[PDB]
Structure formats: structure tokens, C-alpha cells
Design a protein around this nucleic acid. Structure first.
Ligand SMILES: [K+]
Ligand SMILES: [K+]
Ligand SMILES: [K+]
Ligand SMILES: [K+]
Length: 226
DNA sequence: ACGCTAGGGATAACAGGGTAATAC
DNA sequence: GGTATTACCCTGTTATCCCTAGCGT
């Protein structure tokens, strides 16, 4: 009946760790739907030749946000989030927070579903069979944006930053999102790569779908003047 | 003058892989 | 006393979210 407390600082190949893992086989509904959003967003779902099952590597600027994600996947995360400071070619110090799950079979289904030749890809049935409003909220906290950053604007158009996907992949998302959630998303380009524009007249709908899941430190991505 | 949005910046992501601690 | 495992930590690189100049109105 192994407590995770005890795994803290043990060498990777410790028996206690392998015995701890069998206390879990599949992601919860909540974890699965969260994680579908995060994969579309900011999470690395990682399996190289060296890895026996998928794990997650987490990296965010926002401290409250990474600590929230770690609580959702609490079981799978041994060590707390760690501040990392890097110098960049400009010579400026950059701060982020980092966390990792261990490898675990529970991550394999979504790992094989999303990753193909070490690229994230959009499966033709992703939207229909997997994306819920919980998934949409996480995708939005990760990769979400305003069309108009003027603080006093009346234009409440929003963006999902899908630059890393293929045009034809984003066209699938837009088509299936508009059928499943009755949105009027349309495609646009940012540095010649595809993004999802959510028009102003979808704002009340989108808000009412995702706002229930948005944590207090992420409401700003969604909030305009009334 | 003002509302929108295409063009572009320095990160804030996303990645891939080295190091070193248990099991035999 | 190699060899297999593998959590944590280190290094590469840039497409991101975010900002704003400038055009149509
Ligand atoms: K992404
Ligand atoms: K992001
Ligand atoms: K960035
Ligand atoms: K990026």
C-alpha cells in the first residue's frame, strides 16, 4: 500500500517505484480529458527508444498553473515543480517551472494516438470521440489567445495557436469543432502557419463551455471589459 | 480618430538526450 | 562487476502568444 512520499529521492530502478506503479493502470476520465487538451497545448508526451512507456514533461512560466497540472496528475509525479533559469543568445535570464511524470503504460493510449514519427498529429476522429469542454479549457489555457489585446476593445474574438499542426489538420479541427460545439471557427495564418480564429459572436458560447474549468490565475486569457 | 489585423519579437514553450542510482 | 533500467537534470531551438504600426473606414 505504497505512499508516494517514500519514493522521493530513490534511484530510478528502485523496486518500491515499480511496485508503486501497479497501484494505477488507466488515466481517470478527468485526467484523460485534461491531457487531451494539454497535448494540443504545452505538454511533451514523450517516448523515445530509451522509454518503455510514455511520460509527460511539463514546462510553464505560470507557477500556479504548473502546480494545478501536477495536482491533476498527482499519482504520476514524484517531485515538485522546480524553478529553471536559462541565459539566451540576447544574454537575458529566463525563468520557467518544470515537472515530469515517470514512465507509465496509462499514458500509452494517448501517446500512440497523438505521436507518429515524433510529431504531434491530428487524428480524423479526435474531435468527435475525445475532445470535451474540459479538454477545450486546457487547450485554451495552454495555446489560447485574444485576437485584440487592446484592454478597452469590444472585439472578444479569441485564437487557438495551432502553428505546429498542418493546414489540413487545422481544417479538420475547425470542421469538427464547429459541428460538435456549434462554433463558427474559421482558419487564419500567423507567420504562414495555421491558427483557429473564434469570432466575437462565438464569445458567449465559448465562455459558457470553458469558463467553468479555467483556474483563477488563467481567467485573464478570456476576460474583457463587460 | 478609431477599429482591426498582418507583420514581427524574445520568449515560453516543446523537444531530445546525458547522468547517475538500483538490481541482478 | 558489466548490463539493463530509468527518474531527474541538462542543452537545442524556435513557433508562440503577445504586441503594435498602419490602413480602411
Ligand atoms: K502546442
Ligand atoms: K502557451
Ligand atoms: K513564446
Ligand atoms: K513555441
Amino acid at each position: 500500500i505504497i505512499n508516494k512520499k517514500d519514493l522521493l529521492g530513490l534511484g530510478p530502478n528502485s523496486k518500491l517505484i515499480k511496485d508503486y506503479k501497479k497501484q494505477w493502470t488507466t488515466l481517470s476520465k478527468i485526467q484523460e480529458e485534461t491531457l487531451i487538451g494539454n497535448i494540443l497545448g504545452d505538454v511533451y508526451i514523450k517516448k523515445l527508444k530509451r522509454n518503455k512507456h510514455f511520460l509527460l514533461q511539463f514546462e510553464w512560466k505560470n507557477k500556479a498553473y504548473i502546480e494545478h497540472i501536477v495536482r491533476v496528475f498527482d499519482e504520476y509525479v514524484i517531485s515538485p515543480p522546480t524553478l529553471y533559469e536559462r541565459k539566451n543568445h540576447l544574454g537575458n535570464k529566463v525563468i520557467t517551472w518544470r515537472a515530469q511524470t515517470f514512465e507509465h503504460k496509462a499514458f500509452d493510449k494517448l501517446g500512440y494516438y497523438f505521436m507518429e514519427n515524433h510529431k504531434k498529429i491530428i487524428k480524423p476522429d479526435l474531435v468527435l470521440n475525445y475532445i470535451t469542454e474540459r479538454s477545450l479549457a486546457y487547450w485554451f489555457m495552454d495555446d489560447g489567445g485574444k485576437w485584440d489585446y487592446n484592454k478597452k476593445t469590444k472585439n472578444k474574438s479569441l485564437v487557438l495557436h495551432t502553428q505546429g499542426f498542418k493546414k489540413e489538420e487545422v481544417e479538420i479541427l475547425i470542421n469538427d469543432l464547429n459541428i460538435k460545439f456549434n462554433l463558427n471557427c474559421s482558419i487564419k495564418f500567423n507567420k504562414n502557419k495555421p491558427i483557429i480564429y473564434i469570432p466575437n459572436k462565438d464569445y458567449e458560447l465559448f465562455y459558457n463551455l470553458v469558463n467553468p474549468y479555467i483556474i483563477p490565475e488563467m481567467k485573464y486569457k478570456l476576460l474583457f471589459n463587460v
